[PDB]
């Protein structure tokens, strides 16, 4: 499913992402935008290390979910990577919350640093009623 901007903003708010571990809703929106373009079925293979990024937040198979074909992988979210490709994003959200419980926080995603950090992210939630 490809979410429309405000639809996703309201969904994330209902799932308790606003201010989770100090991260504002607009930061989560900026992250989803640049990682997958709000596409839940987005997948990207990293030929360089044999890992794959899955879902709306592009969580990596080496650390977060299990796909069985990634060498030396852990499964911190305790989920099959298939769960991150559903139209219902509850599991992808539960996993993203797990990612930020680690010291790096939102910085765990390189794209957040390049595209969202130190910027005016208000645009991502403006007019959505959240």
Curated annotation (Swiss-Prot):
GO biological process terms on file:
antimicrobial humoral response; defense response to bacterium; defense response to Gram-negative bacterium; defense response to Gram-positive bacterium; inflammatory response; killing of cells of another organism
Entry-linked Pfam families? Lys
Any Gene Ontology CC annotation: specific granule lumen
Q: Which keywords belong to this entry?
A: Amyloid, Amyloidosis, Antimicrobial, Bacteriolytic enzyme, Disease variant, Disulfide bond, Glycosidase, Hydrolase, Secreted, Signal
PROSITE patterns reported for this sequence: GLYCOSYL_HYDROL_F22_1, GLYCOSYL_HYDROL_F22_2
Per UniProt, residues of the C-type lysozyme domain are 1-130
Q: Which InterPro entries match?
A: Glyco_hydro_22, Glyco_hydro_22_CS, Glyco_hydro_22_lys, Lysozyme-like_dom_sf
Domain of life here? Answer: Eukaryota
What GO molecular function annotation could you give as one example from this UniProt entry?
lysozyme activity
Q: Give the family this protein belongs to, as stated in its UniProt record.
A: Belongs to the glycosyl hydrolase 22 family.
Name listed for the protein in its UniProt record = Lysozyme C
Q: Which organism is it from?
A: Homo sapiens
